[PDB]
């Protein structure tokens, strides 16, 4: 399951929990691109908390978001993988993306501290 929440205008949460199926792969991508391109969405902070299990396919959904995200300086946070989550990210070489904090740390601090 997914819950997907504006903070701002341009900052979108994702919580994930349990496992992504296909559908609610392409609900994300749907939901998030359009997000993006036709509305002001330029920052996703992914909060995989709650998420137990993660393939290639979220992996992918990940970076595809990434690349659209290119187009408008747009920023990516994995926030809180679980151990067996952060090591399919370090493996598929999404380390440097990962943060743990609390989704208002995150939003606080992604693109610095605001002052």
Known sequence: AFQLEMVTRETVVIRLFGELDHHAV???RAKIS?????????TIIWNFERLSFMDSSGVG???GRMRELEAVAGRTILLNPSPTVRKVFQFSGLGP??????EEEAI????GIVN
């Open 97 to 102: 993306w990962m943060m743990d904090a609390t």
């Open 26 to 28: 392409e609900q994300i």
């Open 34 to 42: 359009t997000a993006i391109f036709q509305g002001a969405v330029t």
């Open 61 to 63: 959904l990940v970076l």
């Open 108 to 111: 606080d601090r992604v693109r």
